[PDB]
Amino acid sequence: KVFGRCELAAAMKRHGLDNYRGYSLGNWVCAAKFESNFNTQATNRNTDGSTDYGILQINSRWWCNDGRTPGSRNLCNIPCSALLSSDITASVNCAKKIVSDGNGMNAWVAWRNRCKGTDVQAWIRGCRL
C-alpha cells in the first residue's frame, strides 16, 4: 500500500507515534517519506547482507527475522514480512522499540540527513488531526 501523506499521519497518530519519545508526528511522517516514499512494500538490501523493510525501512540485522541475515537478531520478535503489510501496526510497534534504544530517531539515516532540524510540521500541514 502507498499511503497518502495525511492518511499515514492519521494512522501513525492512532497507533501512538505522535510525540513518542519526544518526536512529533511530522518527524515520523518525514522519516517515512524519505525511507519508503510511504510504500509499505518497500524493501532494500544493505551491503552487509541485511535488508530494510516497510514504511520505516526497519533492518533485519537487529529488528526482524528474514531467515537470510546470518548472526542477526530479531528484537521486535516478528518476521520481516510483517513490516510490509498494509496495516502499519507491526512497523509502528517495532519503530517504538528502535527509537527507545538510546539513539532516538538517528537510527533512521534518512531522518538524520533529510528531516532532523527541518520544519517537519510541514509534513502534517492541512491534515485533519
Find the shortest distance in angstroms from Cβ 123 to Na ion: 30
Find the shortest distance in angstroms from Cβ 89 to Cl ion: 19
Q: Which three cell numbers stand for residue 97?
A: 522499540
Catalytic, 66? Answer no
Catalytic, 18? Answer no
Q: How many CB atoms lie within 10 A of CB 60?
A: 26
Q: Pattern 50-79, binding to Na ion, x per CB under 5 A?
A: ----------x----x---x--x-x-----
Among 2, 13, 41, 62, binds Cl ion (CB under 5 A): 2
Of residues 6-65, those binding Cl ion (CB under 5 A): 6-7
Of residues 2-41, those binding Ru ion (CB under 5 A): 4
Among 20, 69, 98, 120, binds Cl ion (CB under 5 A): 69
101 binds Cl ion (CB under 5 A): no
Contacts of residue 87, Cβ cutoff 8 Å, sequence gap at least 6: none
Contacts of residue 31, Cβ cutoff 8 Å, sequence gap at least 6: 56, 105, 108, 110, 111, 115
Residues 80, 66: contact at Cβ < 8 Å? Answer: yes
Q: Closest Cα to residue 75, out of 89, 88, 64, 61?
A: 64
Residues that bind Cl ion (CB under 5 A): 2, 4-7, 69, 104, 108-110
Binding residue positions for substrate: 101
